[PDB]
C-alpha cells in the first residue's frame, strides 16, 4: 500500500517522542565494593571478571604449555601454586601448575 498524504512533523514528533519509545532509566546501578567501579546488582562486575578471566587465560596457557598434545587429558586432579609456594601433602598426587607471579589478594590458598 502507498501513503495517501505526507505525515507532518507534529504527528512525527508525537510518534517519536512518546515515552514507550524513549530509553528507560536503570535504577540497579551500584558501585563494586572491591574495585569501586560500576556494576548492576544482578550482574557480576566487569572489571573483576576481567581480572579473573585474564588470570584464567594465563593459567590455561601455561598448562597447555606443559602438555604437548590436544588429545591428552589429566587422569588426576590439578592444583595451582605461585612463586614461593610448595605443594602440600594433601595436594600431592595431583598435577602441579607453577606460576612466576605472586599469589593474588582475591585468590586464596585452599
Amino acid at each position: 500500500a502507498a501513503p495517501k498524504n505526507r505525515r507532518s512533523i507534529e504527528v512525527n514528533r508525537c510518534r517519536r517522542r512518546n515515552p514507550q519509545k524513549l530509553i528507560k532509566v536503570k535504577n540497579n546501578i551500584d558501585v563494586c565494593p572491591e574495585c569501586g567501579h560500576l556494576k548492576q546488582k544482578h550482574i557480576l562486575c566487569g572489571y573483576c571478571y576481567e581480572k579473573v578471566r585474564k588470570e584464567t587465560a594465563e593459567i590455561r596457557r601455561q598448562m597447555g604449555k606443559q602438555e604437548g598434545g590436544p588429545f591428552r587429558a589429566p587422569t588426576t586432579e590439578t592444583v595451582v601454586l605461585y612463586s614461593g609456594e610448595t605443594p602440600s601433602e594433601q595436594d600431592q598426587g595431583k598435577r602441579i601448575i607453577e606460576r612466576e607471579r605472586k599469589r593474588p589478594s582475591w585468590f586464596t590458598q585452599n
Binding site: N27, D30, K41
Partner: protein
Amino acid sequence: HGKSVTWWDEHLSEENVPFVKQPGSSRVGLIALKLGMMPLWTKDGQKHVVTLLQVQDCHVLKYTPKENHNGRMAALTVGGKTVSHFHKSASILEFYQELGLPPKQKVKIFNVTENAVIKPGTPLYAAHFRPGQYVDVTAKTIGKGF
C-alpha cells in the same frame, strides 16, 4: 532523589535468611484450587467426570453493607490460597495486618443477603457444600494468547 530499587532479600545475610523464613436468600461462596480430573461411576452403569476442587485456605475478609455496595444484597469479601508476605503491596499487608491473617492470592466479592452475613476473619471448609447440589464455577480460562 534517585533512590535505587530494593527487595526483601537484598540486605539480608545467610545467617538471617532462615531466621526471617522461620426463601430467596443466597449463601457465601468459596475459593478453591482446581487439582485435576477423575472418572466416577453411577449405580445405573454410566460414567461421569469429576473435577477436583481443593479448598486450602478460605477466610472471609471484610463485609460491605447493602446500602454501600449495590442496594439489594450485601457484599462479602473472600480470599484464596496463602502467599508470601514479601511480594505483596504495602497497603495490602497493612490491611491484612489489621485483619490478622497472612496474605492471600486472589480476592473475590460475593453477593450475599443480609440474613447470611458472616463475621469477618472466619474460615470456611468444603463441607459448606453438601453432596448433591448445583454450583456455578467462575475462573480465568486457559489463555491462548493472540
